[PDB]
Amino acid sequence: KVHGSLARVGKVRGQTLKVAKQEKKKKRTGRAKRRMQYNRRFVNVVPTFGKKKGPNANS
Amino acid sequence: WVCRKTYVTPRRPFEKSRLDQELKLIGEYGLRNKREVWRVKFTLAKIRKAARELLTLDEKDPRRLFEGNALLRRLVRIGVLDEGKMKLDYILGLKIEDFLERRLQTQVFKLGLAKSIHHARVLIRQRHIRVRKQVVNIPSFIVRLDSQKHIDFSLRSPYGGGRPGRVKRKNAKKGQGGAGAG
Amino acid sequence: MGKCRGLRTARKLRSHRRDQKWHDKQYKKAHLGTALKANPFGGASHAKGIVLEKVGVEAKQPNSAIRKCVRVQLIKNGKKITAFVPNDGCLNFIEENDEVLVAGFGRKGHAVGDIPGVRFKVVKVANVSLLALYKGKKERPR
Amino acid sequence: GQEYAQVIKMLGNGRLEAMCFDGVKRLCHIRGKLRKKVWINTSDIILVGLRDYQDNKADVILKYNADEARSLKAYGELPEHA
RNA sequence: GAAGACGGUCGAACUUGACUAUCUAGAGGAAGUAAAAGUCGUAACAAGGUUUCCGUAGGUGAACCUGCGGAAGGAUCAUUA
RNA sequence: CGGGAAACCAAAGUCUUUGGGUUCCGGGGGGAGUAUGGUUGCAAAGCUGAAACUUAAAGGAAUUGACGGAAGGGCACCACC
RNA sequence: UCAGGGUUCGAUUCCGGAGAGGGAGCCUGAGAAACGGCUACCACAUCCAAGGAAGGCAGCAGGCGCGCAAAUUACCCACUCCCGACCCGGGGAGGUAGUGACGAAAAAUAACAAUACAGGACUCUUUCGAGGCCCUGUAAUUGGAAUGAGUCCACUUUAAAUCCUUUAACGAGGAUCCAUUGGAGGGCAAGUCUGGUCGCAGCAGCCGCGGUAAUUCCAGCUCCAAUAGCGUAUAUUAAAGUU
């Protein structure tokens, strides 16, 4: 009732081809970042009555 | 060594409707964080609770009279509150903006001397603003009534006079060493 | 209303309540000091022990996996306890005769998930944090 | 990449008694994809999974055939005696 | 007017039993539990093909069977003479 | 009327508009009416009554099919006659 | 811990009580059954030329052991007070610095135009089309406009210093003077992703995911939330009208 194996321990982590870090930008300091959020969310942000939309969408 | 907390988080944590409300407040009010709002939602709840207790007391009741009038007078000195209000029946029917409206940051906008709730906070936190003999760097301040008029740039920050700027003064000597001579 | 209503009857009401509190399991646990007396951890929140052996435990249906815990002798009271080793290949990081910091599931003493009869998890070895080890912030020192 | 096994006895409910050709009797658990259409027998070849766990036990993954058994001499697994 | 010293009182401590409370080792043994996808029977979900179940006693590979008194939560809210 | 989750209930009513008197038992399900001590018993047994561990549903009610070696049921030579 | 009722804790900056290795006894003195007094036994430990002899950090530091867990073998009697024969001395009382994300307060890591554009309510026009206010981004770099974090003459602090609160000389074009920690299937805020795997590794408090188009995994990308903090474990409380 245990017997069995571990041979396979860590098989996916070790098979998952590493990815670069890439990079890019810094996102913004405290209140300024809050400000960008508020303009992007609300000012931005006009929205349509498209019956809605999304934040982390592709096509 | 006595100390106390100054803010309180909301029972609950994800109520789109509340989140949007707070974000609009941060934006209008050049705020920094939710705590920044939470701190005020907290300030207000205690005031309202202070108010509600009082309002349940008998009028003329030395305790209700002596402390009610005081709460009101305190609330008015800061402009937070007005006279008809200026009784307890009106504080009960009050809100956060009314406080939020009295901080530095939004005033330095409100009379040109910033043109942004933005500009305002970096101005304040950078020492270019006195409330009359005194620099005040606390974008978080709370401008008292007859103190509204004494807010202005400071005696030396450049506007306010005084040479230029550790970066302006760099630039003057930036057209000096090369383009003048060798 | 199952409960006298006489101005006097404080003692009956007070006492009837004392009598029924028992059935509350959290209450009884506390008054019987169970945490001190039965429990492997002292009535403390964390506990450190030595690794005896590595177990591959057979996750309960409808799930199917080999679980991967160690068996640990707690230094404090020589108690024998099996503890889960979380994340991918982390067994790797604990060896027999190891030392380890164990902590509760967050289940109130009740085993977690599909993982059968295991009530604790490893947190530190190399005195050294499986998390920091798994990431590679820090190593299997030696 | 391990050896195989040989069922010796049956238990029932995700339990079967096997006898590893190497001389190790343990209780192997049927495989999930195999059990779908495979019903281990008390007399047949099988493959069970076993890793860093003393090997005292193993789980059944797939099964085998018989007719091929005569070919097993060709499988290079069983000796001139199986 | 000291050491010492007669006898006593308090009495730590020590030695041996008794007492009470709390805790704890243990070859092995027998329960219950999990539980569960196993083996042997069909005991009592469709009248489960022996209606079911309770109290109780005796007995059986095993579910269970059976007598004696209950209940319907039954398969009858009726019986028409 | 009103109650209740409903089945139902003139009491199971007068219960969030929660307060007539008093008594008893329960706090998820299993472990268990079990262990252990006390008590009563000639005996069989009865009363009081845990835990470790186990587990995410146990359970209730109504609704609907499916299905029945339940009742009235039908229909067809893929059923019988 | 907040409806109200309540619910739980309290060794711990004060008050009252108790002890200074365990037990017992006693001297002195107004006050002690005192242990930075003594004395015996009992348990412990130490020096020795072996006959002897000397000791008690639940004081301040520090050290061992223990553990989930806890700081300098630092400076001063100047403050605050205390004691003595005392204005004057003495105080690990106490202050002072060092360590210090228990935890609590303030809240930096970038603001303003301009072109440049991307856009929407407003107006004009039959439409096409154009104007227009409120502006936000988003680059393009500009352009002038900025401040301590560091660094540092001087000065302050104070017993003397440190730091704060003070400032000449320096210190912001992003590749920074470089913000984090959890989450993104449901509850639950946020990928009807791309590569990889294929009920494997893992995820998952609970329900549940993964058996080859994985929105739960493993990674990136992207996005969310709380933010100089955030996750995790645990006692306990609220939620719980499940005492």
Phi, psi of C52 (to 5 degrees): -85, -55
Q: How far is the CA of C139 from the C1' of G139 (A)?
A: 45
Contact between A4 and D49 using a beta-carbon 8 Å cutoff: yes
Bridge partner list, C81: C72
- Whether the CB-CB separation of B143 and B77 falls below 8 Å is answered with no
Q: Which residues neighbour B45 within 8 Å (Cβ) at sequence distance 6 or greater? A: B8
Written as one string, the DSSP assignment of B133-161 is: TEE---TT----GGGGGGEE--SSSSTTS
Cβ-defined contacts of B151-156 (< 8 Å, 24+): B151/B104, B151/B107, B151/B108, B152/B113, B153/B113, B153/B128, B153/B129, B154/B127, B154/B128, B154/B129, B154/B130, B155/B130
| Inter-residue contact C81 to C23 (CB < 8 Å) | no
What ranges do the domains of chain B cover? Answer: 13-175
- Closest to C64 in 3D by CA, of D60, D5, A30: D60
Q: Which residues of B touch A31 (CB under 8 A)?
A: 26, 30-33, 36, 121
How many Å from the N-terminal Cα to the C-terminal Cα in chain C?
Answer: 69
DSSP letter for C18, please: H
How was this structure determined? It was done by: X-ray
> What residues have CB less than 8 Å from B132, skipping those under 6 apart?
B147, B150, B151, B152
The token duo for C37 is 């007396």
C91 contacts on D by Cβ (under 8 Å): 52
C137 CB-to-strand F distance under 7 Å = no
* Ramachandran quadrant class, A51 (left: phi over 0; alpha: psi -120 to 50; beta: rest): left
What is the sign of the dihedral through the CA atoms of D42, D46, D50 and D54?
positive
Query: Which residue, B98, B129, B92, is CA-closest to B111?
Result: B129
Query: Resolution for this model in angstroms, one decimal place?
Result: 7.0
- Distance between A38 CA and the closest CA of chain B, angstroms: 6
Q: If you ran DSSP here, which 8-state letter would residue D58 be given? A: -
Distance between the alpha carbon (CA) of B61 and the C1' atom of G85, Å: 63
Which residues between 2 and 31 in chain A have a beta carbon less than 8 angstroms from any beta carbon of chain B? 30-31
A24: Cα within 13 Å, side-chain hemisphere: 2
Q: Is C81 helix (H, G, I), strand (E, B) or coil?
A: strand
**Cβ–Cβ gap D52/C54 under 8 Å:** yes
For every residue of chain B, DSSP letters joined together read ----------S-S--THHHHHHHHHHHHTT---HHHHHHHHHHHHHHHHHHHHHHHSPTT-HHHHHHHHHHHHHHHHTTS--TTSSSHHHHTT--THHHHTTSTTHHHHHSSTTSSHHHHHHHHHTT--EETTEE---TT----GGGGGGEE--SSSSTTSSS--TTHHHHHTTTTTTTT--
The residue range of the domain holding D57 is 1-82
Given a contact cutoff of 8 angstroms between Cβ atoms, the answer to whether D71 and D81 are in contact is no
- For residue A41, give Cα distances in angstroms to A33, A47, B19: 12, 9, 11
Residues D43, D8: contact at Cβ < 8 Å? no
The CA distance from A9 to the nearest CA of chain B, in Å, is: 38
Q: What angle do CA C84, C88, C91 make, to 5 degrees?
A: 50
Dihedral, B93, B98, B100, B101 alpha carbons, nearest 10: 170
Q: Which amino acid appears at position C79 of this protein?
A: K
Report how far residue D18's alpha carbon sits from residue D44's, in angstroms, rounded to the nearest whole number.
10
Cβ-based contacts of A41 with chain B (< 8 Å): 20, 23
Tokens 């059935």 found at:
C23
Considering only alpha carbons, which residue of chain C is nearest residue D28? C58
CB C37 within 8 A of CB C29: no
Comparing C-alpha atoms, which of C65, C64, C77, C73 is closest to residue C120?
Answer: C73
Cα B157 from chain centre: 22
Distance in angstroms (rounded) separating the CA atoms of residues B92 and B71: 12
Distance CA C113, CA C131 (A): 21
- Hey, what are D30's tokens? 């049927």
Distance C32 CA to E17 C1' (A): 36
Buried b (16+ CB within 10 A) or exposed e, C52-69: bebbbbbbeeeeeebbbb
Identify whether the C-beta of residue C40 lies closer than 8 Å to the C-beta of residue C74: yes
Alpha carbons B176 and B169: distance in angstroms, whole number: 11
* Cis preceding linkage at A43, omega within 30: no
- Single-letter code of the amino acid located at D10: M
Q: What is the DSSP letter of A59?
A: -
C-alpha span between B31 and A31 (Å, rounded): 6
Is D51 within 8 Å of A3 when comparing Cβ atoms?
no
Q: Which amino acid is at A33?
A: K
Best A33, A36, A38, A45 residue to mutate vs chain B (most B CBs within 10 Å): A38
Assess D27–A contact: CB distance below 8 Å, yes or no: yes
**Directed axis angle between helix B34-56 and helix B17-28, to 10°?**
100
Neighbours of D18 (CB within 10 A): 25
Place of tokens 């506990």: C47
Number of Cα atoms under 13 Å in the Cβ half of residue B149: 1
Q: How far is CA D13 from the centre of its chain?
A: 17
The Cα A46–Cα B150 span in angstroms is 39
- In this complex, do B23 and A30 lie within 8 Å of one another by their Cβ atoms? no
Task: Specify whether the CB–CB gap between B123 and B108 falls below 8 A.
Answer: yes
Residue C2 burial (C-beta neighbours within 10 Å; 0-12, 13-18, 19+): exposed
Domain parsing of chain C, residue ranges:
2-142
Q: Which residues are paired to B178 by β-bridges?
A: none
